[PDB]
Structures are given as structure tokens and as C-alpha cells.
Design a binder for this molecule. Structure first.
Ligand SMILES: *[C@@H]1O[C@H](CO)[C@@H](O)[C@H](O)[C@H]1NC(C)=O
Ligand SMILES: *[C@@H]1O[C@H](CO)[C@@H](O)[C@H](O)[C@H]1NC(C)=O
Ligand SMILES: *[C@@H]1O[C@H](CO)[C@@H](O)[C@H](O)[C@H]1NC(C)=O
Ligand SMILES: *[C@@H]1O[C@H](CO)[C@@H](O)[C@H](O)[C@H]1NC(C)=O
Lengths: 159, 89, 83, 138, 169, 168, 89, 90, 138, 69
């Protein structure tokens, strides 16, 4: 219909981002985190952000020799935290307490197993990661890859 | 915590309708994120239009009460191009 | 993290009562068709995730052990009690 | 060991999906000319002649096996009843296709849970296929 | 070091080796069969094909869910604490969710492994990916998990502390 | 009208709790009320071991030994063999794995909460007035309104988690 | 007695002192095998000491341990009781 | 005579139950009395959970859940976190 | 596979008692010219040079191994310190002698519990001894 | 007493249950050196085994065979 879905366009963005891989280390354009980090480092003003190689914001973000807090994946402050001194611990792989609540609500569900049986996603553990399909990706001949897996999931996304 | 650009304007209109005491029939309806909601109108809700995320009113989409969808940043720029403000691509 | 909005236009109401005490009855509310099971799998949780230290406990600690400064007509003034 | 290289040479053609099963040794009722994989497949525990001679577990196994062959004869894949709808198969375990490569070569074992094994007789189908194939020519 | 298009670190030898691998990834019969099953992923579980690569690279660590009446034990702040019990057995876990294999003792509670065992079982496993005779340093330690006071490597035996650094002299 | 007609389930097991007279008509539930009677009986013996917990008639280490598979007969401990109902617990803590692990967990909840909140209990399967299953089944406490057909059994897919409309 | 419990697992035993292998279930209590399983697992084990094709009668039965109502042997299928004797006719 | 001298076992673990003054001599058992003290401490907490059994302060299903590896914190059951000594038993 | 037929042909002579051990793979301290069976036997964890480099479990293992060789060099049997006293050996597991027959061929594995295994490399010492011994002559 | 040796053996477990604490001795409380010399190490296997069913060898005859010889 328009110029977008033409094959003349999608070859150009693939030739653009493949050059951007050997230039920037990313198989993508820079996201909102990486632009804000560069413009803060350029003019030298405080509050430089932090980006954990995925393009998203790193969670706990401190400014220069001052207060510190944590941020979601959008650039906005979490209101229940501003801790002077040590950096906080915001959801850094702390998914047990949410998962503890699912087990207690399954514990207090009637009796006899009428439904409580039926309460990784489905059809992925037994099609992709077991059936020889992921094994070409995270494997090879030796150590000389250092293949970042926030680059391969950027490789399949942009291509 | 400090105040978003919405709630700067929503206090500035409302005390101007309190200091001067002359009412203005518009006040924004921004969400929790601080930026504007796309649909914007007054308390009587008779002409609700789509707005840009920066704040300026998108010229043309002044419906009579409820937009089903709002134009986003491409389709505004893609159509104003087709009206002819430079950069024919 | 998932976002659950708990307020509306009808969340707060005021009125002068004894000529120097402007009361306010804040009413948080949140629809149950906003909170997934994977977020809060129990109605007991939606009690405790609301009355707990995140929302109600942090707010009581703001108005008790702190300060709160409203900004009207270039006049800054405190606004907290406990009752 | 022919049926492996029947599948693996067919799968490296990459012209169609390749699937493989393997029935276990089923000791009971050896009074039938059919054997332990066709009877689970062509509706034999439901026959009027074979009424009561099967349990409610071999019979209920032999309905998810009929769903395996039905979704294959309809769509060439025993997980999807059509070739244009790809919702999640919520009837049994999702069959993975025979990937003709090391780290793969998957199949299905027709037991009560229908599990996904990986590599059938890979010791012995390296014997007749790699040892003797050097002994016969040399 | 190096500065790219922005404030980026460029190990260009690392970047060139990835694209050599990426061209060899597309020249495979078994990537086309990976891509066929990536189409058949539903929309809610994965929006884009990068989200297919998000779930598949994450599902390789998802062991099958335990018995439904099991409930884990968290810390004060919630940090998925060490000794993790169920009906008779207890075991020990990492910070992530899985359990350390072989640590499933029966009755009582296990001792979670010290700095020794998770250092030597790495280098016992790394010993299994060596040429024959090509040894490397395996920190041998006591049954209580504390280090043996004199570690040895390359026909040189040195005394250690309770932490791992060689005290000089 | 001189014969005693009780009634059983499939494979001939008596629903104990009655015995018919020569001139009576035995009430016999079907397919939904048994799954409501056993839940009523589960809450019943939940309330039994919270009463003996209040009455202080058994040690606190008693359920630990039955869990570990150690069975002390009353001949061992000097006391008369039936003077407490000792073998009640060792029966109803060894009825199943998933059964008794809930029956303790429901009772320790119901001991402290009655001694002191949330209006939440177990799930009683609501039936119709005929005796069969209501086709919609809502669990207050979670928000799951699912559907059940044909003498029990969750039909797959039909699960609804916290919606405004009732699942037809 | 039959069901023999310990810390988490229970199992089932003979009269003599040993336990039946494979009956060590986890949690709850196992069902001790009926007249079917100790008859067929003998003749499944005796099947393993036969020539190839030389079958013999294995009593197949349900998951509840009760017999399948029609047992078969030597291309002859006969109905049974809940005990083991062939009812005539 | 101004320093606080306690005494430990091998590998430096304090026998808790005391703390010396600047002008005292700490009694320290050896090699047989610890194996008599722990048995005295075993009979002591044997007599503890027979007192709470008489006092009727804990449910009868409490030790069943700790046996099965299910740990209920006091935050779950509504009661204040230290109002009973709940985590003694577990 | 030589050491099996070294033992088994020696044991069918029936002139003396035959015993066999087998050390496991011991990954640690590969900085020694001696290997994992002699160091457990000739008192190496107690040496003044090797002070502290061994645990209290490899050392305590290497005293019941010294008792094995001592009772052999004294009496030809690693269970009895004399050739005329046959009380029960209450120091470790009782070593059974290498019976040169099917259903036997026992040995000792030098691990922490010192267990009695039965048949070392019987797959692989049927390879070099029964397969190739027909391939070499024919 | 027709193979009813559990109740005698139940008493040995209860007296081991009520023995102090801590395992100071309670570890040290088929006979020894027989399970791992005779019935495992190929020595009994010539006796109760053969070529086929045609023995019916009574084992209150073999223990009478070694006794009288
Ligand atoms: C109206 O109120 C504003 C408040 O800032 C004031 O500045 C202004 O002078 C008033 N009058 C007019 C005519 O705008
Ligand atoms: C808040 O929103 C509701 C729903 O649109 C509306 O009815 C109400 O009038 C609004 N509040 C005010 C003060 O306008
Ligand atoms: C809010 O609080 C006031 C003061 O306690 C009370 O009179 C009123 O009923 C409450 N509710 C509403 C809806 O205003
Ligand atoms: C226990 O029983 C007493 C009477 O003996 C009663 O007053 C009390 O309410 C009961 N419950 C609790 C939790 O104490």
C-alpha cells in the first residue's frame, strides 16, 4: 500500500542496523535510556541515567553524590523509595514473595482436588528448548563468541 | 515530588478562574503518568478532541463528543506533509 | 511491575467544619477488573496490598511523621492531622 | 535402525514435517494379530467385540492417540487439527518434530503420560549404521 | 577504550565474531525449522518474534513446576532464602529459583555449600572439558566446607586464609 | 413395606449416616451434593481438631509423629486403650497427602483467626435445587468463576478471573 | 500390617519383613496390590524367561486392581468374576 | 582486672548463657559436661513443649505443617509478628 | 582389562586367595607423581611434608586402607591380622575374595564408605577379551 | 509365633527411640560379615541356582547335606 511494507524499505533498515551493530554494539537504534545518558554526559549536568545493555532503564538509579531511588522501564520515579546512602533493592529477582502468595491461595482452595490441579509458558519447554531448536543458538565450537542474548533477541527482532 | 505539566496548567487555569473569578470552560484531564490524555474537553463534555502529547491541539479532530481513535505522531506528521509543510518524503 | 490506578475524581471531598479545620475524607477505590491473579491472587492480598505499608501505611507515615505543603495563591501552608 | 535412517534421511530433505513414535513393550493380551501401536490408533479398545477387555486407562490412552493420527491426516502435524489455526494443543503433550541433527532426533513414547524421549537406539543404530558400514566396505 | 556512536564500549573483535556467527545461523536447515515454530506462538505470550526469543531463551531454565501444595520461604524483605523444605526432604537453592542438584538431603536440613564447593564443582566440571593430563586448580576443602589450609597448584603449595586469597610469604 | 432399603453409590458402598425403616423413603443425593457433603464434612473435622486444640487433650508433638510415620498405640503409653479417641487423628492425618496437608493448614488458620479480618473460607460447590451441578461455579476468595458439567469436572478453557459479567 | 509408613513415604510389605518394590509412594498411603498384580507381575516376570512368541496367560486388570471382566488366553476370551475362577458358559 | 574474658569451644563459638565481669573468673566446662548440658537442655525444651501443650496456645496441626515443610509467618495469619513466640517451634 | 584376566586366570589356579581393588577418579591435588591408590595406602596423608593438605576424611579413609594392606602382608587376607584368628573384622567392610566365576568377580572401590562392587568393566573387558580375540585369530 | 516377629522387633525400635538424644551411642546399638561374603560374593549362587526347574532341591536337605558330610 505505502512505501513501508515494500521490500525496498526493509532491506535498507537491515543494511542500516547491521552497520549499527559493528558501530554501536546494538542491532537496533538507541532507545530512550541511551539518548538521555549521552545528553547528560555531554553537557556534564548531574542525573546521568543507567542502562543495563537491554535498552531499558536499569532499575535502581542514583544521581551524583546525592539521593537515590529506583525507576521502572519508562523513566519515572518509584514513589515508595528515596534512600540516601546505599542503593535500594527494587524487584531485583525478588519474585518469590509474589509466588509465595500463589501457593498460599492454592493451599486454601477447598479440598479433594476437584479443580486445584487445573488452577515457562505452555508448549515452549517441549518444542523449543528441548527439541534441538535452541541448541544451534546458545552453543558453538569454543569460547570465541561472547554472544550477548540481548543481541540475538535483537537480531531476530530487527531482521 | 513535583508537579507535571498537566497539573501546572490545571491549577493555573483554575485559580485564574478564582483570582479574576471569570470561569474558563476547559480544564485538562491527564492520567496518572503526568502527560496529557489524548482526548480532552471540559466538564460538559460536548466537544472532545484529540491533542498532541506535548500539548498543542491537533487541528481538525474536533469531534462532537467522543473520538473513537486519536491520531498518533506519525499520522499527524504524515498528513500535514500531504498538506505541504516541507520535506516531501 | 504493573500499574494499578487507585483514585478517581470522586476520591476526595472537603469542607470547613469548625472555622479553622478544613477536613478531608480521602476515598481510594480500585476496580477488581484491574488487578490480575498473577499480581494479587487473593482478595486477602488486595486488602493487605492496599492497607499495607505501600499505600495506606506510606500515606499515614507521610501525614504523621512528616510535612505536607499545599501551594495556593502563592501561599504555602501545612495541611496534616491524624484524627 | 532402518526406521531411524528412514526418518533422518527424509528429514534432511526438509520438504515436509517429520514425526516419529515408538511403542513400548505391552505384555498383556498377546492374542491379537495387531500389535501395541495400531490398536491404540485405529480405535481397537472401543470395538464391540473387544468390550471390557481393556481398562479405562488403555482406552483413555487410545483416544489421545486417535487424536494424534487424526490431526496428522487432517493437517500433517499431530498438534493442530487445521493447517491454518495454531492455538495451543490442550489435549496431550505437544509432539516435537524429528529434528535431523545431534542434540535432537526426538520421538514419542506411547505410554500412559505420552512423554517426549530423545534418541531411539542411538547406541544400537550407531552399531549397524556406523560400525558395520565401515566393516562391510572394508 | 573505544567510543562508538554514543557512549558505548566497542570490542570490535567481539562484534565481528557475532556477525560471522549470525550469517552461519541463517545458513542452517534447522533455523528454518526453528522459524516455522516461532510463527505458531500465540500473540498474548509473545507479541514480536523478539518476544519469541525472549521466552525461549528464558524457558531453557524453567524446570517443571513442583507439587502444587509446596510453598517457598522468603526472607524479611523477600529474597527466596537458602534452606527450602518440603515433606521430608529439604534442599538448598540459588537466588533465582532453581535448586542445587545433589543437595536434596532427607530429613532435617542441609548445609548450603560454602565458597569451596561452588568454586571446585565448577572447576571439576571444567576439568571434564580439558585435554588429558591438563590439570587446573581445584580448591580441595574439608567436610565442613572450610578450605584445606594448604592449597596446591602447578607443583607449588601455598597456605590460604578462610576466604581464598593467598597470604604472602 | 416391610423391607429396609438403604442406598449406595457406584460399586455398592453405603453412604453411612442412616438406616431406613420398613415404612420410610430414603433420601439419596446425587453427583453434586456428595461433593458438597464431603466439603461440609471437611469443614466439620476442621472444626473438630480446632476444638481438641482448644480443649488441650493431645500433645503438640502428636501430629509430628503421625507425619513422620511413627504410630504409638495406647498400650505403649500406659493409658487405657480407648480412653481417649487417640486413633481418630492417625486415621484422618493419613487419609491422603494433599488431604491432611490442607486440613492442618485450614485448622491453624481457623484457630488463630477465631482467637482474634478476611471473610474467606474454603470452597463449597453450590448446586441447584434439583440436586445436579449449577453450570457456572464461582469461587469467592480468588475471583475464579469457572464452569463445571456432568457430575463434576472442570471443562477446559472456561476460566474467568475477575470480570464484570457472569460467565455464561 | 500392610501399609508401612515413615517420613513422607509409606509403602506396602509382605507378611515376612521385606517391602514390595515399586510400591514406595510419596505422601498419603499406597494401596497394597490386589490378587491381580501379584499374579500378573509373577507372569510378567515369567514371561521374561520364555522363548520369543511363547506367550502365557497374564491377568490384565484395571487401575483399581479389580480384574478386567473378560480375560483372554490362547485366542479364547472368557468372562471372569472378581476372584479369578472362570464362570462357565 | 578490667577485661571481659568469656570462653568458647573449638573454632571459637561462645557458650551463650553468661558474660564475664572485669573482676570474675569464668567457669568453663569440658568434654563431658557439654554432653550433659545439652541433654539437660534437651529435657528442658522437652518440658517446654509439654507446657505449651498444657497451656493450649498452639494448634495441634502446627507441628504437622513444620514437618511437611510449610512455614506460615505471623504476617499471614493477621496476628502481630511477635505476639506469640511462633518461630520458636519451627 | 589385562588386570581382570591377570586376576581371573590366577584365581582359577586355586592356589591362593585373590583380592582386587579399584580406585575411583579423585580430582583433587593432581600435583603428585603418585596416584589415588598408593597415596591412600602408603601413609601419604600423614606425611610431615603433606601436613594440612588433606581433609579429616581422606586421612581417615587412608587408615582403613593401610589396615587393608597390613592385614594382607601379615596374613594374605585383608580381614584378618593373623592366619590363625578368625574373629569378625570390625574396622571396615569385610573384603570378599575374587571368585573367578559368573555371578562373582568381586572387588573393592576405594571411596568414603569402601563398598563392595561386583564386576569391573565387564562390558569393556568383554570387548577386548572376547570380541577382538575372535577378530584377531579370524 | 508363625512369622510374627514384628512385635518383638517393634520393641527394639521403641527402646532405640527413647535413648537420650544426639546420637552419641545410638548408632552403635542377617548377622555381620555374612551378607557381604556369602550371599553376595558368588558363593551361595552355586547352591540355589542351576540349569532348569528339575531340582526341587529342598533347603532343609542341603543344610542337612553339609551337616552330615
Ligand atoms: C487576573 O488575575 C491574574 C492572576 O495572576 C493577575 O495577574 C491579573 O492582573 C488579573 N487581571 C487581569 C485583567 O488579567
Ligand atoms: C470525574 O469523571 C466522571 C466520569 O467521567 C465525571 O462524571 C465527573 O463529573 C468528573 N468530575 C468532575 C469534578 O468533573
Ligand atoms: C467522610 O468523613 C466525614 C468525617 O468523619 C464523615 O462525616 C463522612 O460521612 C465521611 N464520608 C463521606 C462520604 O463524606
Ligand atoms: C475455647 O473454649 C473456651 C471455653 O472453654 C471459649 O471461651 C473460647 O472462646 C474457645 N476458643 C478459643 C479460641 O479460646
Amino acid at each position: 500500500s505505502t512505501f513501508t511494507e515494500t521490500t525496498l524499505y526493509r532491506i535498507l533498515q537491515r543494511r542500516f542496523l547491521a552497520v549499527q551493530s559493528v558501530i554501536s554494539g546494538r542491532f537496533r537504534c538507541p532507545t530512550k535510556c541511551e539518548v538521555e545518558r549521552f545528553t547528560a554526559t555531554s553537557f556534564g549536568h548531574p542525573y546521568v541515567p543507567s542502562c543495563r545493555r537491554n535498552g531499558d532503564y536499569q532499575a535502581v538509579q542514583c544521581q551524583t553524590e546525592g539521593p537515590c531511588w529506583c525507576v521502572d522501564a519508562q523513566g519515572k520515579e518509584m514513589h515508595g523509595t528515596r534512600q540516601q546512602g546505599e542503593p535500594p533493592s527494587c524487584a531485583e529477582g525478588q519474585s518469590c514473595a509474589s509466588e509465595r502468595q500463589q501457593a498460599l491461595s492454592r493451599l486454601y482452595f477447598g479440598t479433594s482436588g476437584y479443580f486445584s490441579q487445573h488452577d515457562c509458558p505452555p508448549t515452549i519447554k517441549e518444542l523449543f528448548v528441548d527439541s534441538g531448536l535452541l541448541r544451534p543458538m546458545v552453543e558453538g565450537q569454543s569460547q570465541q563468541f561472547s554472544v550477548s542474548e540481548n543481541l540475538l533477541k535483537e537480531a531476530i527482532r530487527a531482521i | 515530588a513535583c508537579l507535571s505539566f498537566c497539573q501546572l496548567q490545571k491549577q493555573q487555569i483554575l485559580l485564574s478562574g478564582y483570582i479574576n473569578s471569570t470561569d474558563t470552560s476547559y480544564l485538562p484531564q491527564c492520567q496518572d503518568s503526568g502527560d496529557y490524555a489524548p482526548v480532552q474537553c471540559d466538564v460538559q463534555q460536548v466537544q472532545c478532541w484529540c491533542v498532541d502529547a506535548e500539548g498543542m491541539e491537533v487541528y481538525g479532530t474536533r469531534q462532537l463528543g467522543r473520538p473513537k481513535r486519536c491520531p498518533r505522531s506519525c499520522e499527524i506528521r504524515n498528513r500535514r506533509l500531504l498538506h505541504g509543510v516541507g520535506d516531501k518524503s | 511491575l504493573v500499574s494499578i490506578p487507585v483514585c478517581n475524581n470522586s476520591s476526595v471531598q472537603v469542607g470547613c467544619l469548625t472555622r479553622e479545620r478544613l477536613g478531608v475524607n480521602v476515598t481510594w477505590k480500585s476496580r477488581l477488573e484491574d488487578i490480575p491473579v498473577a499480581s494479587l491472587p487473593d482478595l486477602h492480598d488486595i486488602e493487605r496490598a492496599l492497607v499495607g505499608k505501600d499505600l495506606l501505611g506510606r500515606f499515614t507515615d507521610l501525614i504523621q511523621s512528616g510535612s505536607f505543603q499545599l501551594h495556593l495563591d502563592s501561599k504555602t501552608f501545612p495541611a496534616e492531622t491524624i484524627r | 535402525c532402518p526406521i531411524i535412517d528412514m526418518a533422518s534421511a527424509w528429514a534432511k530433505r526438509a520438504r515436509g514435517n517429520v514425526f516419529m513414535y515408538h511403542a513400548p513393550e505391552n505384555y498383556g493380551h498377546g492374542s491379537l494379530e495387531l500389535l501395541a501401536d495400531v490398536q491404540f490408533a485405529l480405535g481397537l479398545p472401543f470395538y464391540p467385540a473387544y468390550e471390557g477387555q481393556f481398562s479405562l486407562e488403555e482406552k483413555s490412552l487410545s483416544l489421545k492417540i486417535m487424536q494424534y493420527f487424526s490431526h496428522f491426516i487432517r493437517s500433517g502435524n499431530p498438534n493442530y487439527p487445521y493447517e491454518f489455526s495454531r492455538k495451543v494443543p490442550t489435549f496431550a503433550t505437544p509432539w516435537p518434530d524429528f529434528v535431523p541433527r545431534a542434540g535432537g532426533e526426538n520421538y514419542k513414547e506411547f505410554s500412559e503420560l505420552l512423554p517426549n524421549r530423545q534418541g531411539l537406539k542411538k547406541a544400537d543404530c550407531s552399531f549397524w549404521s556406523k560400525y558395520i558400514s565401515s566393516l562391510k566396505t572394508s | 577504550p573505544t567510543v562508538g556512536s554514543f557512549g558505548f564500549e566497542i570490542n570490535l573483535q567481539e562484534n565481528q565474531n557475532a556477525l560471522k556467527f549470525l550469517a552461519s545461523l541463517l545458513e542452517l536447515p534447522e533455523f528454518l525449522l526453528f522459524l516455522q515454530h516461532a510463527i505458531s506462538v500465540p500473540e498474548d505470550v509473545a507479541r514480536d518474534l523478539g518476544d519469541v526469543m525472549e521466552t525461549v531463551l528464558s524457558s531453557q531454565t524453567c524446570e517443571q513446576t513442583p507439587e502444587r501444595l509446596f510453598v517457598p520461604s522468603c526472607t524479611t524483605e523477600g529474597s527466596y532464602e537458602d534452606v527450602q523444605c518440603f515433606s521430608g526432604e529439604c534442599w538448598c537453592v540459588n537466588s533465582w529459583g532453581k535448586e542445587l542438584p545433589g543437595s536434596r538431603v532427607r530429613g532435617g536440613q542441609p548445609r548450603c555449600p560454602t565458597d569451596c564447593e561452588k568454586q571446585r564443582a565448577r572447576m571439576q566440571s571444567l576439568m571434564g572439558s580439558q585435554p588429558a593430563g591438563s590439570t587446573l586448580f581445584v580448591p580441595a576443602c574439608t567436610s565442613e566446607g572450610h578450605f584445606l589450609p594448604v592449597q596446591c597448584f602447578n607443583s607449588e603449595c601455598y597456605c590460604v586464609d578462610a576466604e581464598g586469597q593467598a597470604i604472602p610469604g | 413395606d416391610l423391607r429396609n432399603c438403604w442406598c449406595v453409590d457406584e460399586a455398592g458402598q453405603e453412604l453411612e449416616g442412616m438406616r431406613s425403616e420398613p415404612s420410610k423413603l430414603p433420601t439419596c443425593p446425587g453427583s453434586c451434593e456428595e461433593a458438597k457433603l464431603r466439603v461440609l464434612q471437611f469443614i466439620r473435622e476442621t472444626e473438630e481438631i480446632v476444638s481438641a486444640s482448644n480443649s488441650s487433650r493431645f500433645p503438640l508433638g502428636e501430629s509430628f509423629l503421625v507425619a513422620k510415620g511413627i504410630r504409638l498405640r495406647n498400650e505403649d503409653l500406659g493409658l487405657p486403650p480407648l480412653f481417649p479417641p487417640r486413633e481418630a487423628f492417625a486415621e484422618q492425618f493419613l487419609r491422603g497427602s494433599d488431604y491432611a496437608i490442607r486440613l492442618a493448614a485450614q485448622s491453624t488458620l481457623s484457630f488463630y483467626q477465631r482467637r482474634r479480618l478476611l471473610r474467606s473460607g474454603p470452597y463449597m460447590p453450590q448446586c441447584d435445587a434439583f440436586g445436579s451441578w449449577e453450570p457456572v461455579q464461582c469461587h469467592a476468595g480468588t475471583g475464579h468463576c469457572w464452569c463445571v458439567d456432568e457430575k463434576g469436572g472442570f471443562i477446559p478453557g472456561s476460566l474467568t478471573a475477575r470480570s464484570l459479567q457472569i460467565p455464561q
